[PDB]
Design a protein around this ligand. Structure first.
Ligand SMILES: Nc1ncnc2c1ncn2[C@@H]1C[C@@H]2CO[P@@](=O)(S)O[C@H]3[C@@H](F)[C@H](n4cnc5c(N)ncnc54)O[C@@H]3CO[P@@](=O)(S)O[C@H]2[C@H]1F
Lengths: 175, 175
């Protein structure tokens, strides 16, 4: 169960740090369209994570970054936590604006399957992704750092539109 | 074996990326004392990782940062990889200059032991650290990205001087 340790590292190293500061960082960008106050984490179950999000879906477009976050982590002075704001389109229209990013450890799982001494078979990527998502979902439930600031988007492709999948979660929070 | 997955994530997510660019980034700082061309990663086996390195040892002092590194990681535009340069002192003298940082996943292991649903007992921190160091050492041996650009410093405290432990590795590379 590699995913278990990566899920915790994902919370302890990243979400536990950025989420409490997240809501303050978003409304700082607005004052300086409208951006949603939740962090949207894409969780593809096939464990493939493009680097450029715009090449995952043409309807997902990059707009601008957030004001960064600084902190001293394990001796590194002012380690930089940055996030990107993406606009999702429908039929050439702007259907919403939010901070959107993949879950990096999914990409790392994909990499581990290729390396020989990782001892991780490529057939287990799908099951480890399911464990990663389920484990993380258990974290954010009891996570004091996370209260209505985060939504995990998990999907398994069978042609697929990722923009519509995100917009679905987006329009449900509008209710 | 949580450490196994974290060791691979440490290589795939961080060292595999920064090491090939590392030697070029150091000699760029010099042209712009002298800094060593190796990245020094502290690996305390008790899994305790201070955030401010200067409070680990008074003889370890912060000097300046390196020119940063940019890349698009899992949808985040220009994710920032930064590093800090530290000066190590002996009897009020500057005994060397190099980039020095703890291994972050050691800090995460320490955190996981505290959380209830992590299923990770605090008695296993020492054994998981040993696994993390040994696993990582196996990675960097066959790692094409790492050739004489990195040295792992592992130590187990019994009063302890961390500066002397680092300087030992530093003076051996001078040979
Ligand atoms: N700024 C950021 N932006 C976006 N996501 C982020 C994020 N910081 C964390 N996360 C997420 C949490 C997870 C574990 O974070 P953690 O700090 S406990 O363990 C890291 C660390 F030891 C080392 N490392 C990597 N980059 C860096 C770096 N710039 N400076 C220092 N050390 C680094 O490599 C390990 C694995 O990295 P990953 O990216 S594969 O997984 C990360 C990623 F999914």
């Amino acid at each position: 169960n590699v995913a278990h340790g990566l899920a915790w590292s994902y919370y302890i190293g990243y979400l536990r740090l950025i989420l409490p500061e997240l809501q303050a960082r978003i409304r700082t960008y607005n004052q300086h369209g409208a951006v949603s106050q939740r962090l949207y984490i894409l969780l593809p179950l096939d464990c493939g994570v493009p680097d450029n999000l715009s090449m995952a879906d043409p309807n997902i477009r990059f707009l601008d970054k957030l004001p960064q976050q600084t902190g001293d982590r394990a001796g590194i002075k002012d380690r930089v936590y940055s996030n990107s704001i993406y606009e999702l389109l429908e039929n050439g229209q702007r259907a919403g604006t939010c901070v959107l990013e993949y879950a990096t450890p999914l990409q790392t799982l994909f990499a581990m399957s290729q390396y020989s001494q990782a001892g991780f078979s490529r057939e287990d990527r799908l099951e480890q992704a399911k464990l990663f998502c389920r484990t993380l979902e258990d974290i954010l439930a009891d996570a004091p750092e996370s209260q209505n600031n985060c939504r995990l988007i998990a999907y398994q492709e069978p042609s697929f539109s990722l923009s519509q999948e995100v917009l679905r979660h987006l329009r449900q929070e509008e209710k």
